[PDB]
Amino acid sequence: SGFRKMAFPSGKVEGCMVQVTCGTTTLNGLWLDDVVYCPRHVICTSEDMLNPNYEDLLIRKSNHNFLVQAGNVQLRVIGHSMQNCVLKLKVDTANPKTPKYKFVRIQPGQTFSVLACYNGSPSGVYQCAMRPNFTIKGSFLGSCGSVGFNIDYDCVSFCYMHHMVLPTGVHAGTDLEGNFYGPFVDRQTAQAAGTDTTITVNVLAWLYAAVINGDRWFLNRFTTTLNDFNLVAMKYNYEPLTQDHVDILGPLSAQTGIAVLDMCASLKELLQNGMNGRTILGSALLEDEFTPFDVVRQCS
């Protein structure tokens, strides 16, 4: 019963969050095995950030310039190297709380949980989605280095590490191999994120979640084709719906008895008519940060 935005249990990730200080800058790091991962811009001064040469800046840095703290333990750095935009600090102690993990690079429209931290200490956890323009709308104050993750069986799939807030207020980051999501760079300049679109397959999954929970007023009598729907969808800044998206929604269609293209026709009428002051699952707008897998996971 009920449907809320749910984050994964954060226990396995809390045991990996450490503090990393370089000069006056203090941000968060991820301590897996004997390596601490953190954004490489921790080595930059505020003046360096305008046009940094990270290769030259890192060469000037010494191992003792990085102060790593794990709760009350001071971790000695015995080596440091640069992995794209992620600084890797080799430490003399392996994390005894290291979970089974992997590094994944997710797709636009996929969701994950963020363990927001400050000074290496966990503050809270929340669920968000990678926007189609590779930004994320989160809660980031000293929050740099906080990671995004999913949990599959007993394995923690790390997929995101926060790096910066754009002047537009949106957030940008990298995967755990240091590659930025989107066209962004770790440099203090004006950076334009692309036109953001609505994750169509996520809206349809959220509409199925409403039907599963008894909220059905928006269902109509029609069907449509993928092509006819996408013509209406492109006018309202919705991502085009693919046959892969229809196949992904299959299980929800089976549980509800509502064909995917039938639900697409209901969404098509919702876009052209609006809600007329009505709500769906307690929301007055269409929610697009629940993937079809998220709905299946919570409803099962």
Added chain:
Amino acid sequence: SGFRKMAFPSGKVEGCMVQVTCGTTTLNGLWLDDVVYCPRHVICTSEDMLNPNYEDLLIRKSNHNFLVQAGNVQLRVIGHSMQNCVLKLKVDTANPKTPKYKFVRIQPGQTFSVLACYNGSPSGVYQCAMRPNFTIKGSFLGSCGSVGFNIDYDCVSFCYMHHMVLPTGVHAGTDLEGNFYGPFVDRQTAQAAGTDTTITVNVLAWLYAAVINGDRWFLNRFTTTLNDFNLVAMKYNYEPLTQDHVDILGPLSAQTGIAVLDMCASLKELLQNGMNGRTILGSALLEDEFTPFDVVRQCS
């Protein structure tokens, strides 16, 4: 930057969730020290639930009738007693992952994090609020026994344990001492929850959060009195605002430079006029599940 509904890190609570089975019924339990806490209706059959006599039903139960599982460990029950509506199962092993904890009974309008579990295994975590009518709108499927909690410094304050879904779809539970929140009983009958109201002090805190994050269009030029505001508030099913509520909002007023009664005047106009198709922090309705402490915690 940004403002999302955030839950506490769930690590300390995950190490306490166990499975409790009695007959065909399997729900969740809380393993603190050498005691496992779970709803007492686990001992009821579906026919017993219509009109249960828990004292007589518990007397017929034996220690070996309770199957407690902690991951892969079978916990032997060496004793059982009834604490109001909470069954306390004394086990032969103390939980080595027992955190520093306390049992608190919260007030209507306060928030907490729920670690939703199924068969003693954590599924997800989310933030919710105790409605003024002592119900909660959550995500509960086998979810009975999942607990709500806050974190203060290093201490886990357990405040809620889920017991049942009302036929109205709302959820009801108890504190960790077994006392129900509200007029509800652990008995399968039609139970009316009171008329629910909007947590006024939470809306005002959420409006301050919008001002802190640059969303200011709703601010007007007026002020009001507590009495004049409450006359308008009672017409729209908002809880009356007290002087204690005004004192609680003090810090947010100091950070924003907007007096509490000035913000009350802005909310008064929002209730009478609506939003006129506008959004506040990305929402088309007024959010009331952020306490003033929640806003202070996330924004600081």
